Design a protein around this ligand. Structure first.
Ligand SMILES: Nc1nc2c(ncn2[C@@H]2O[C@H](COP(=O)(O)OP(=O)(O)OP(=O)(O)O)[C@@H](O)[C@H]2O)c(=O)[nH]1
Ligand SMILES: Nc1nc2c(ncn2[C@@H]2O[C@H](COP(=O)(O)OP(=O)(O)OP(=O)(O)O)[C@@H](O)[C@H]2O)c(=O)[nH]1
Ligand SMILES: Nc1nc2c(ncn2[C@@H]2O[C@H](COP(=O)(O)OP(=O)(O)O)[C@@H](O)[C@H]2O)c(=O)[nH]1
Ligand SMILES: Nc1nc2c(ncn2[C@@H]2O[C@H](COP(=O)(O)OP(=O)(O)O)[C@@H](O)[C@H]2O)c(=O)[nH]1
Lengths: 430, 431, 114, 431, 430
């Protein structure tokens, strides 16, 4: 009844989808074979007559390796074989390759399977698109799929949990290029975009989980916990329910401004757990700590516009109200003048389930804070000069041209990002 | 399922190809008779990248062996892994090119090139999807350089979009093997600039330096040099063949390495190269691997990176490692040596991670540097070419094969323009 | 409960009956490879080696490192590998006792290190 | 978690440092292969002070070995605890300094000092917090004294705030080994006064006297003297490594010991040093240890305290004892020997207690005394230096290594100024 | 509800805090794990929802060893991990090091945790600062923290239980220096400063406890018993309850004169116990004996200004009045002319609890005499010569100068202790 269709595009999307679906299977008791030994799974799983539960997900990639690892691993009997869609040639970190030449047939088949999945959903809260801003497959094919979804499905809420390049550390070279292109693409298609940075999540793991060697599996586990906290209000009942439609209506002040900082709390290992109270006020403060942001962007530079809090576990409205009052009275946290409330609290009675073999401990309470704040303009400012530093010399431009782009596409994307900067400045200022 | 067609050209190219195919057969658990004997499913995951299955369990390399004299591939067949190759893929002439690029490209290469392209097309059509062709050969030799460049031009004409990867053994700076090395290298670089999408420069003297200083071998035969080259050629494509935490194909490396089409010449290095004495004493850590990667002695090209500036640099790591450690290490390297890195590129490092290390190694890493230091290599070769061309020494050998004098001038002009590109982007300032 | 094996880029999807099921947890086979990868990541990537060594020595009252297989299972549970009982048994059987539970923590760590 | 970087210099320094690392590994239960076999949690609690954890369970000492000839550290590596050290920490030249401070500080130390500082910086940057550096070497030798002074100056420039501790084996009064010992010592003292924050003065003949009168040994090789020095070097820092009832770090010892910065030379002693014969006949009591501690023979320094006046004196006890007992004993010592103690300092005792005694001994105590007695040692070194320098015997080698003859006058003047400091604060009156 | 925040700075502060918290746990029945098998613990412990009682204490030190001993000791699950604060480099017996360079970040974090702790207290009777005058950590960091608390918290009563150097016996060489500095500091911040001397407590253990080899554990146990006697009226009810706020007004005649001798009675081992009557009169006379002073300062040279008696156990008010009347009629005990009353009696119905493994015997009655007397200026007179004798030659001055200190500070500290000398002379005078 409250079905949400999950799309995982690119290596990053698929690798966070592995963690997400492991988390969902653990949360709903679904064994990796597919079936579990009510109807809270309907948001993410559709049950067949035999009793087997198949997720409403779609793994899209132009490279066979990442999807084939899923086909070979433990969750080989869980996902639908045709739902796993694999290309033949990788996009090679080329937005043009993933958006104009290789991505066409792949996204056509993706729309076909998405249509089949939506036909199996009585309701449809929306789409959860998990991709990687900064890679040809994630950026190009993800943008193409988002455009097609906006064309056909229309008003369905598409929540894009994008992973943007980190400020200083990075793994690709043309990452600013395809990041700017994908940002121009998804500024006008996704309904709520959530920013995530590998540097920020590495910092979170190093400080809070005390992992000196964090890895992609740990990052994806944290992201999966964030998304599970987001969707907990759809699957488990609780006081102050939040809906997928309600996230926008409480978070997106203007259509252009829909990019979101995310912070989960508490992030504590098994060793350091049960050593502090971890009460509601403390975990709310931890969530509002700038160091707990999953984006390398200091909120102190900007001003919060909206803050949606998702509480999980033993949380009471007295406690959430007191915590939010303390946060408001805190002088470090600064809100815009035109949003006096700026807070959307939603509680859920289901504590976050702990993945065995993960570093997170079993905490009876959790807070997931998703904030629309004008500080996020800083990361766009960083990418805006990282892109144009190369684009002044037109470095790697011939690569993008070879697969059917023009200098005009780069110019328009960069102009749109500058306009987004101007819009952020305008909304932040009085 | 992204197939790579290997081509070996000339004596040096054939020996390097034999070593490389023996290394790959070891890595995929293929015995010299072709049967799989690895006892690991990871070996057969992506064996199609390099091999085709026979009627039985036999696996035949997607390799094409080239020569104008049969002796070199007679030795190749007599080698330990000479029987894996399909005998139909051995293409030989009868009179070898006398270290004459003209003979290997115009007179004697013309007859054999039809058969070479037939074999290449037959191997390429069997491919489900074709990543591209990798050609191992040596600049400064007749059949190798001439035939390899001719085949590269033909394959570029037939398959424009497919990748072209080249492993060229550029003549060594300090000691020259043959006299006509500057002529052959100058004529071959002109073809490789226009045709080859991706090129790796190797120097025998640099390999001697690395095998005598790091491996500490005192009498290294050509087998050791071919072994190091084969390790590099395996590590460059290990991401295609094994699952990776952050995988990256040849096209991805080319996109992240090549800023402008003509600047596709790279110097490569492979880590960790450890002496037998210090094998136990050395610590396999990501910082240690990165430190050995960025050392100038680790480069297999004669030019040292210190003189030039790194335009780009890819690092394909192998092993169960922290992506945080890898990214932090190379970011720290960039910050420390920012003088040696180009300013107008915010990030000059392309990190790739594969989950499967080479056999016996806990961790490893191949480094591919696009740096303006190769400018001095080209400059030296041009200094030799001009000195010989001014007095037309040995020029009659090329002239009597039906090559115009103007072709030498055109090749040297192109090579000097490439040198100008490298220097201009070395001293190019942002804004 | 079929197992999908990718041979030369295509999915064999072999039946469970054909597989010998050596019950050793060998990383060579892709069936047990994720298990070994998880154990390695938790022991080395996530946990500090000094902490792992201290945990393993704590069960060793003789201080010679000689740990029983049951003690190794308890150590893995304490280290939060997250494995099931059968997976932990296979990871323990990766090493073989010398006389009577005479495998020591350094040998076990060497087995799971590379 | 307050690390110490150990450095060994010269043959004598390298031997003493090897013995010291053997003793420390014995204390921490580290076998020569690096694995922990101590069966005590406290031993591994603060093992990071001296060691770093390797890839396995092995622990590598934070030690750096310097030499200009390879034989000494070849013997060190062949010794019982030679394999613990990292091979990268062994820095050697090829031609040893011919007991020439000029050769070890200017000509032959100049090239090796870059590698020495590189290894030192690598070891120091790995430390989370750095207490400082400790350099063990011998005054009166070429490579030892020369490279020790040069490295101490370099490290002082790099890390001015970090503690610098030195264990210098001053040439013996009565029987001298090499001819140029007074020259080398005079040149080294000038550098040690300016750079080293805290310095221990040791004598081979003083060690011989203590080992024949207290230990009553028959044939004491250099190993026994090195063992005594190693015991003192462990006991000076056992507070950092083990919990103490009243702990005191190196900087605390320096602050409580050094009245004025240039008067940082100290004589050390270790208790209880008992003969094998009288092990049962002696009784281990704090008054016994104090009585042995304040004996003139217990000093490892040739200068006897009786002639001079004790400016300050620290006593670091190890073992389960009563702080009342220790404080009362040392106050009683001060009252009894008040004539030998400086008047304008009301308390000349810095007593510290650690809860972990050395293995085998129920309790122990190390003594570090800053007294004006060492004035006579510096005076004797001057009486030799002047005797040779008035005729410039043996001086032409030092002149030929590129150090000016005025430098000898500089060094002698500075050492004589230090003598003047000791004498005037010996005869200084209160009010 | 009548909470007192405990602070322990330096090795001596933390090591007396070890005994203090052992004693409080034994007195309230709180097990080392954290929980006990009404609301009398609230003064020293805050109970959590799980039932675990965590002490309202803060262990501040720049050296890691002493705090790590607590973190590894039996009381590892009782104390809060963040409450235990450990530095990196020791003050090295340097007041400048502990007050100017190293102590800044540590004291900032200390005030952070102190603010958190004081938030969890409904009321706040005051602070109990246990430190060591005579060491950089105790002197420098303790003085800095006292300044911080005086400025921010303000009118909360801070009781500084300071240990000054003994007249003849000592363990440090710059101990006169940093003692003069820290006395110069704390003359103006602490509200009631309790004087202690190791030599005096050693003599007490030697004669009364018959301990020929006294140690720091015994000294700290005695100090802890004294402090428990001080705080018994906050946690247990009894006739003549005395409050922390009552101590100053009943004991401090003038703002600067707030240094106080402390004396416990009885100090008897088990073997000598139950062998004398130990009546109220006899224990009072013992408390007023010169040897029972925990400071090497003969009361006979001066005159008592005020004497506050804390009785614990089966004590009847006529007995306290008769004993104190005999004390007044005693010729040896001499009061100032201007304080005819000079006595502050306070009884409590809880006998002193005995620490197992200690030497103190189970005595049904106990007296803690805390007296303001003009005699105590003698110890400051001793240090005033110990200081200037070294300062004339400026020995060890460069060490203090190196960490941001000046000749003016030494001179001003000496001036201020001379001022304190004149103040004690003037309060003694008619
Ligand atoms: N947070 C996070 N980011 C990841 C993870 N895996 C990959 N990424 C990011 O994803 C980017 C590349 O993803 P993809 O575009 O899908 O790579 P691909 O599958 O080879 O496809 P192309 O790069 O377009 O050719 C990298 O720059 C990484 O920063 C992950 O596990 N967690
Ligand atoms: N009564 C008593 N006094 C102690 C004890 N431990 C240390 N002291 C005294 O405390 C003084 C020094 O205290 P601290 O400043 O804390 O010593 P620290 O922790 O090493 O810090 P710094 O000396 O400043 O470096 C010494 O002179 C001792 O006299 C103890 O257990 N009981
Ligand atoms: N690394 C390596 N280099 C070789 C080998 N054989 C020849 N070379 C080098 O290759 C260069 C060109 O020789 P080559 O191309 O093989 O001659 P050709 O076959 O007649 O064209 C010579 O300068 C040799 O130094 C070999 O086995 N390994
Ligand atoms: N205690 C001790 N002293 C030594 C040892 N070996 C040499 N010495 C003394 O150290 C003094 C200085 O020698 P040294 O500086 O090491 O010579 P160098 O290495 O050539 O500079 C000599 O006079 C020796 O008497 C040893 O093993 N132990």
């Amino acid at each position: 009844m409250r079905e949400v269709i999950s799309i995982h595009i690119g290596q990053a999307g698929i690798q966070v989808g592995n963690a997400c679906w492991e988390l969902y299977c653990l949360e709903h008791g679904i064994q990796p074979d597919g079936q579990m030994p009510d109807d809270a799974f309907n948001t993410f799983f559709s049950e067949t007559g035999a009793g087997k539960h198949v997720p409403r997900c779609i793994f899209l990639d132009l490279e066979p390796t990442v999807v084939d690892e899923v086909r070979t691993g433990t969750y080989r009997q869980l996902f639908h074989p045709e739902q796993l869609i694999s290309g033949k040639e990788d996009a090679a970190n080329n937005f043009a390759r993933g958006h104009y030449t290789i991505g066409k047939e792949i996204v056509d088949l993706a729309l076909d399977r998405i249509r089949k999945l939506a036909d199996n959903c009585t309701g449809l809260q929306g789409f959860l698109v998990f991709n990687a801003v900064g890679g040809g497959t994630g950026s190009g094919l993800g943008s193409l799929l988002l455009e097609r979804l906006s064309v056909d499905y229309g008003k369905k809420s598409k929540l894009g949990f994008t992973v943007y390049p980190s400020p200083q550390v990075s793994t690709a070279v043309v990452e600013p290029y395809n990041s700017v292109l994908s940002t121009h693409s998804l500024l006008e298609h996704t309904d709520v975009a959530v920013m995530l940075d590998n540097e920020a999540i590495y910092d979170i793991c190093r400080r809070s989980l005390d992992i000196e060697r964090p890895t992609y599996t740990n990052l994806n586990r944290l992201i999966a916990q964030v998304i599970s906290s987001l969707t907990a209000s759809l699957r488990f009942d609780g006081a102050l329910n939040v809906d997928i439609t309600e996230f926008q209506t409480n978070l997106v002040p203007y259509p252009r401004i829909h990019f979101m900082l995310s912070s989960y709390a508490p992030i504590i290992s098994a060793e350091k757990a049960y050593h502090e109270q971890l009460s509601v006020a403390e975990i709310t403060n931890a969530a509002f700590e700038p160091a707990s942001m999953m984006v390398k962007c200091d909120p102190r530079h900007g001003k919060y516009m909206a803050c949606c809090l998702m509480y999980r576990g033993d949380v009471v409205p007295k406690d959430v109200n007191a915590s939010v009052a303390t946060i408001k009275t805190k002088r470090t946290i600064q809100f815009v003048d035109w949003c006096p409330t700026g807070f959307k609290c939603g509680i859920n009675y289901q504590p976050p389930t702990v993945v065995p073999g993960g570093d997170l401990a079993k905490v009876q309470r959790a807070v997931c804070m998703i904030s629309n704040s004008t500080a996020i303009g800083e990361i766009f400012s960083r990418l805006d000069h990282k892109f144009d530093l190369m684009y002044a010399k037109r470095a790697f431009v011939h690569w993008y041209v070879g697969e059917g782009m023009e200098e005009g596409e780069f110019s328009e994307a960069r102009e749109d990002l500058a306009a987004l900067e101007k819009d952020f400045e305008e909304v932040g200022a009085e | 399922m992204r197939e790579i067609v290997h081509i070996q050209g000339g004596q040096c190219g054939n020996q390097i190809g034999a070593k490389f195919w023996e290394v790959v057969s070891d890595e995929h658990g293929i015995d010299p008779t072709g049967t799989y004997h690895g006892d690991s499913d990871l070996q057969l995951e992506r064996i199609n990248v390099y091999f085709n299955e026979a009627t039985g369990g036999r696996y035949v390399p997607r390799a094409i062996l080239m020569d104008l004299e049969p002796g070199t591939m007679d030795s190749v067949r007599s080698g330990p892994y000479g029987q894996i190759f399909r005998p139909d893929n051995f293409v030989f002439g009868q009179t070898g090119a006398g270290n004459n690029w003209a003979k290997g490209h115009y007179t004697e290469g013309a007859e054999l090139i039809d058969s070479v392209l037939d074999v290449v097309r037959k191997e390429a059509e069997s491919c489900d999807c074709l990543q591209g062709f990798q050609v191992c050969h040596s600049l400064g030799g007749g059949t190798g350089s001439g035939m390899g460049t001719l085949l590269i031009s033909k394959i570029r004409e037939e398959y424009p979009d497919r990748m072209m990867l080249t492993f060229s053994v550029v003549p060594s700076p300090k000691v020259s093997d043959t006299v006509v090395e500057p002529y052959n290298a100058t004529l071959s670089v002109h073809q490789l600039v226009e045709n080859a999408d991706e090129c790796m420069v190797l120097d025998n003297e640099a390999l001697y330096d690395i095998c005598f200083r790091t491996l500490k071998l005192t009498t290294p035969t050509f087998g050791d040099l071919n072994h190091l080259i084969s390790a590099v050629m395996s590590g460059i494509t290990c991401c295609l063949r094994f699952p990776g935490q952050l995988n990256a194909d040849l096209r991805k490396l080319a996109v992240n390495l090549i800023p402008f089409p003509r600047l596709h010449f790279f110097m490569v290095g492979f880590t960790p190269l450890t002496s037998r004495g210090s094998q136990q004493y050395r610590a396999l850590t990501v910082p240690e691997l990165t430190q050995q990667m960025w050392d100038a002695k680790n480069m297999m090209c004669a030019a040292d990176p210190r003189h030039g500036r790194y335009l780009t640099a890819s690092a394909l790591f192998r092993g169960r490692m922290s992506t945080k450690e890898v990214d932090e290490q190379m970011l720290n390297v960039q910050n420390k040596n920012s003088s040696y890195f180009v300013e107008w590129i915010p990030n000059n490092v392309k990190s790739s991670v594969c989950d499967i290390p080479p056999k016996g190694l806990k961790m490893s890493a191949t480094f591919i540097g696009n740096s303006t230091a190769i400018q001095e290599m080209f400059k030296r070769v041009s200094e030799q070419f001009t000195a010989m061309f001014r007095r037309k020494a040995f020029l009659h050998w090329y002239t009597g094969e039906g090559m115009d004098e103007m072709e030498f001038t055109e090749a040297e002009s192109n090579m000097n323009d490439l040198v100008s590109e490298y220097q201009q982007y070395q001293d190019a300032s942002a804004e | 409960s079929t197992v999908t094996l990718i041979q030369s880029g295509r999915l064999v999807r072999l039946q469970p009956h054909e597989r010998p099921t050596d019950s050793v947890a060998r990383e060579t086979r892709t069936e047990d490879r994720p298990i070994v990868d998880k154990v390695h990541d938790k022991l080395f990537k996530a946990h500090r080696e000094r902490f792992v060594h201290k945990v393993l020595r704590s069960y060793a009252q003789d201080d010679s490192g000689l740990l029983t297989p049951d003690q190794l299972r308890s150590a893995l549970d304490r280290l939060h590998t997250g494995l099931d009982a059968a997976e932990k048994d296979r990871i323990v059987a990766r090493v073989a006792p010398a006389q009577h539970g005479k495998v020591h923590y350094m040998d076990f760590i060497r087995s799971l290190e590379s």
